[PDB]
């Protein structure tokens, strides 16, 4: 019975494409990881999967438990989701004029959403967040860093898929930097399996190789993608892209490049 | 390697999803198909990818060859992958002020668009698309009926996946406005209910309000994360009239064919 027993399960084990219809050199392949096939859309949906499973395995809460949020963070909808596959409890603090659209969503999720002063930012969320579980039972609440910026995620899950669906056959790793970037933790992650995989990180105009990109290309590349494979994908996987393209230019025959697309149109 | 070899072999075989967290009778279960997983966001790239197939196996065109269509009709964006795959060109023929973001869209995807007159409409975009064929090379252009209607595709690919992904444990299939998925599993069982689920505006059909089909949007994001948009809503709400009078060892399938 190939049956997803919850939404839950709709994250990861997103597509892989190889883009065949750019003529690129000899023995020279790509591929682009759609991250943007995650529930939330994006690949953030990961970390808060995440956050929450390492929260239990940890024994920081259990099943049953509540879940204080200082405010969703790079969480996506994967928090909500795990949170649901475990009866956790979400609520999330958030400073009043925070993040409107977010908190919306979160509400829609069934999460709880309490208000914060709305000058004391970031810092009176986590203070709120922190007299809460010393209020409640079962409950915990994640550092800023947990709830933003943790590599872990994608070490244990994203790195795992790209080096499974290739069968170890990769030499060159291309995304996204930032805290909603993917290099983190993948990277690190294809490095242990392989110290010849050169890593690429791509950084916009707001690791072994640097490519910096301009949004006149990254839009350039939106629209080849369009044309060429029928891929309808953000300005960041056109920024990928492009820095693939560039690799793909120098590469000797036997070269296989992952670049991971995290937006869609 | 599971590596997909180009977006058209995303077509379909979109999830399906179990609903477990609404109260249901002893017995009974619920299951989901997310259409709104396919490329273009809906089930209608089964069709066009399926258009393009049906009419490379019939012979009226080979790669390489022309696809000259009325309007985009019911394809999605399955056309226009299906047409990559095959290296076959795509010129849509539309009137001039005829679906505007649809003409963006299929220009996006590298199709030729053509204008017809607004005011001939359909008929002048058939038309202008019977004329090309008669002036190019493997050429094919689909009646209107292929580009809309055609209930062969979903017959072919949608029905085949519920029964295999339920192993045959079907009971009561429920969908919005159905044709050639209800076909396919009444020929496996004759004994599956098919529901149709009608919006305000064969063996039961639901007429669901706007107001219920809202409701039910809510109370999927609510219960169980499910983000989607309001003909999921009305086809949830007709199957949770099914489920409530369902007695045990039934199991329910239904189509959710729009995100939120």
Redesign the interface.
Known sequence: ??????????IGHT????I??FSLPEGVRL?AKLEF?N?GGSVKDRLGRELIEDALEKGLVTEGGTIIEPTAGNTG?GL??AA?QHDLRVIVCVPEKFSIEKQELMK???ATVVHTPTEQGMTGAIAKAKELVNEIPNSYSPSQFANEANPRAYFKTLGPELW????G?INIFVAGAGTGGTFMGTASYLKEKNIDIKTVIVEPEGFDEIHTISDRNAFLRV?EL???????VGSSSGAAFHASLLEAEKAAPGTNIVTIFPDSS
Do not use: C
Request: net charge neutral.
């Open positions: 019975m190939n049956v997803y027993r919850g939404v839950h399960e709709l597509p892989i494409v190889e065949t219809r591929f096939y529930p909808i909500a989701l649901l829609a999720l069934g499974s669906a290739l069968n056959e629209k369009a044309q060429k494979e029928g891929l309808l």
